[PDB]
Amino acid sequence: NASIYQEFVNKYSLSKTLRFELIPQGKTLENIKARGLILDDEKRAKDYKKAKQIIDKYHQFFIEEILSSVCISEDLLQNYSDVYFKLKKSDDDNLQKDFKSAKDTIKKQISEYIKDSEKFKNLFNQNLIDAKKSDLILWLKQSKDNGIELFKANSDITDIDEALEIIKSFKGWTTYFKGFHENRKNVYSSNDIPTSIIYRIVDDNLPKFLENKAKYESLKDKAPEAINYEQIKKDLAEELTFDIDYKTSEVNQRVFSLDEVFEIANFNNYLNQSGITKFNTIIGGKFVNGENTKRKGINEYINLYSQQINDKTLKKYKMSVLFKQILSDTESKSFVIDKLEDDSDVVTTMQSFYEQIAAFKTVEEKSIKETLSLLFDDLKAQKLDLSKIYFKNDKSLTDLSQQVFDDYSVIGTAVLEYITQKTEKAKYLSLETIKLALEEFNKHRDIDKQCRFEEILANFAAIPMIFDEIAQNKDNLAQISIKYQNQGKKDLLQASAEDDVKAIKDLLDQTNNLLHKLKIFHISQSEDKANILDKDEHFYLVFEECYFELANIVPLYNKIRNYITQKPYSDEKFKLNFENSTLANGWDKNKEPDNTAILFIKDDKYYLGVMNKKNNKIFDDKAIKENKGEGYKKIVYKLLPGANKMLPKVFFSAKSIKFYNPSEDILRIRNHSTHTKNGSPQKGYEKFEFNIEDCRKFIDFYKQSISKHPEWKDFGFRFSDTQRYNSIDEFYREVENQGYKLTFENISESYIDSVVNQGKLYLFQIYNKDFSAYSKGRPNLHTLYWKALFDERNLQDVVYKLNGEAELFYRKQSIPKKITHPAKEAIANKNKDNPKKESVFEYDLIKDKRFTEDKFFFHCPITINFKSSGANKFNDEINLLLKEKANDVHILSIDRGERHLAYYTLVDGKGNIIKQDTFNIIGNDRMKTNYHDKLAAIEKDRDSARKDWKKINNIKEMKEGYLSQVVHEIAKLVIEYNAIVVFQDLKVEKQVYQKLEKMLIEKLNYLVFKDNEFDKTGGVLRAYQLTAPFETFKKMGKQTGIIYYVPAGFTSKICPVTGFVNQLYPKYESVSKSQEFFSKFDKICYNLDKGYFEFSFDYKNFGDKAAKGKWTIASFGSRLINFRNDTREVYPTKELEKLLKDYSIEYGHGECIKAAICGESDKKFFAKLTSVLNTILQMANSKTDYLISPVADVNGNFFDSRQAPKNMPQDADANGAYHIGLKGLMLLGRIKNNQEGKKLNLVIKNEEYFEFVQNRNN
């Protein structure tokens, strides 16, 4: 009963962070509030955000200027380009080395250029914000003297002066920014990483540019007239203006030709965000206020011309936009709507609009309602001149048809063949041509099904009622406006306002719809002075006045939509520093005065004390010595981190180098770094080849120095024989493994009490619900990990290790405290499976109680498997174990279907189903829960409410919850049955399946069973590790640890015993084709003994080349068919008896029917016979559900899911999972025969799958 995974324990390390609540103890909270630390930290969090925004501005300016200045050699770009296109069609090593060379040369030029700048030197050091005496202060000051306002765009920072005060507010807090500076270093890093502007230029934007150039030349080749050069030279002249032509070095500013912008040297104009925006606008165009139609870009011209000549080939030439430059926060060249700030904007602007509509009067001094009703009544009457009023020939006309005639092309076809009874598309079509066209249309076609002009006119005559429909909603809207007219509330986007919001939208929607109905008449002012059409001038006068008034909808609709759908602003939590910028940076004893955070253990409870900055020596040696007592157990923490950095730093430092006294030999080894393979040499020195003797000499010097070190001796290092080391990193591993020690000092309760009472110490209990006195149940895994940190059994040989850089947070009360359930009153139980109908409690229950009050929080990082390195070649070790233990492994295959979120079959090595069940139901013996219904309801809620401007909440969390249950079920199955897990290779449902794969991988990184013993496999100290860390969905491939991924092909409709799958798919087309189809069968004969017909064939002989194999299918069994009279039960053998008797084909003696079948010439015969064959071939029969097989097995048995053995699929879903598991079986066999040193092949092909699945029982 021992798991085959028993040895897969303590395999590799990983980092985790545990989260707890901090409960202030004693007079701590009152002292905190007495010094105002919390509010100060809120202020500091906002000020910190602002400071990062200012520094970010400085970064942006620097990037812009330095990239403007950069000029890449045209020869470099040309070289890169030639190698880059040669790489297409050829993988030569010479080509990849040359490409690496060119790319790296360009990268080096840029990198060196920005590194040499004056402003880069001071970018990440303290001189930026707190000059010892700042470049930031200087730049801000110049920007003020130059009268240029940087912070105009954002609300939080008013002006430059405020930025000065904010920067100076961090006078002594530069270290507080170190992490941030790291992030900013990633912006300029010369390493190969996506966060670098060098990477963004060379890896991202250069290939995209060269691709756009290729597509452009090719576009001029295939479609020269596709793009209108004069037009883009006019519209985009602004974005086509460049200072320098890098091809000619000419420095004069002018608009460039598209030929010039795609000059390779002119790529030097697209480096920074300004050039990127220009280029991307040349591609995408822009909107301009005061222009009716948008200014077209290249891609628009390509699309339009491709649709003009009806050639989708041009699609391949659509150009890609350049990615943004990093950090750049820049304005768009296209028009940007203004924003409504709060609810008062919404209600007041809406009211203003609808009242402006109500009060407006035309030239004729009639209301818009009366005016439109008059115009459309006169139009219904035929009083107006139909030749002088026109519909826009665009989509609006189509929508008119579909609105009245239910078919969109009716009008367009009608005029189209009206002309027939080289015609280019007109912009407008007069109502005359319409009327005549659809009249002739009704004359040329069946009368009863026809479409009349009076229906159009009746639609336009019915339009005016929409105003009446709008009035009532307008007044109740007035009520809502009374509700929301408050100036700064901004709570209209709270979910609680849903109803209201919907109402608002409804109103707008109505009006919006109205506008579009009238849009068909409106004549946009797009300027073409060629032809002005003669029109009824009065009709269009009053109309265009009304429509111009109603067109104010679209800005209003956009502004309201953009405000309402915003994500609500919730304060969330902020970092508590307790006046210390290095608060939780490290737990080491020697760093206590600096980091001021200390851990205690009292009784079975844990505590975090934070020393007040003023008195940080509260716990120094003297104080622990004279306060030694039985109150609290203080943790003393010793760590030697980054040995590869720490040892040279300490031993070769200017301070102590004389003390450690390294020989000139060791100095040499260090200078040329001969002790390392790829280590960094000392600056100014040349890296020299690795020498094992130098390595071991350096290791000996390290041992001597450690034993000479005043402090580090205390670690009690036990080092391997230095001759055993083949590389310095094995020594460093032993150093870091043993350089971590946790011991405790006992401190009197009276001293702790006095030092908290004095406000010198801030004491918190580290708490989660498992530390309550009432908690009798299994604790959270994170509670077990936390406790394991300080456990003796862990301290003797450390697996759980405490990390520095913890953080503390404060979360304000988010929700008003509401007592949902008063005490002593019975509460209805939600689970219908619950034996207990209701429950009563002695105490109150408050919904979301934790959010009803302010709270303190502790995020503590830890390292698991501290003494193991990271995962390396994990799949190979898994596969070794599985090959060794192949006899015992089960296959747990998981499929997804319409009926189940996840369905699984457990199978053995022989193909027998041990277990088959659904993951829909999760529960104990007492209760159970079905998540399928709940998930369905979620998916409905999304799509429905999405059109209500209603907030969707926590659907992904609701899915991941369920999944978090099923990963536990799977883990249990896997350990219990020595199983590997097999998934199908891989819209929303699919995403749930993928999320299950990812969360299962992560679960199996570190697998602890709560009931297992602390020191035994599966327990806290010995956790199964059955997968490596998740990387990315693409990188899952075919195997992640004990999880494998197989193609899903042909797992649905296939016989479990014979592996038969229907590839015939016969359809009736003609008598000739039917005779040809039935002639190709080998033998169609009747079995007297068995009592059914038999069709024997070879898939080779039929149309599709892919199919193969000999088969004999039988008419045996029942079948189910659905039809519009419900479903009925058909017996194809009897049906065939009827058909053959009707045509006097004699099957009674068991003769062969093929020739007879092919001899008939009647359509009904072959139609019905092909139908019978089709129903026979139908394995999946669903009542309006079971699986059946037309192929007999060795025993002459036909598989029937309705009555089937335990080890066979009992339904179709289980059949799909079962075949997933059969592909898993193939994988197991390959794993079993895999040889050492040879790569394992996990790709399954349909041929291999069909051969295996057909021959396993045959």
Add this chain to the structure above:
DNA sequence: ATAGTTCATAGAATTACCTTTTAATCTTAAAGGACTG
């Protein structure tokens, strides 16, 4: 009867709101820089 299609479909842009995955840095004690005593 009955036997099949549609409730319009789709492309190229721009703006806005919302959402997601993915990829980087760190999860440190102690030397150094200044200054004070």
Add this chain to the structure above:
DNA sequence: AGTCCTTTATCTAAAGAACTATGC
């Protein structure tokens, strides 16, 4: 010497109802 605040050291690795069509 004592302190506070900042900078430093640098390995390993590889659907369902309605409409359309007569094919029943």
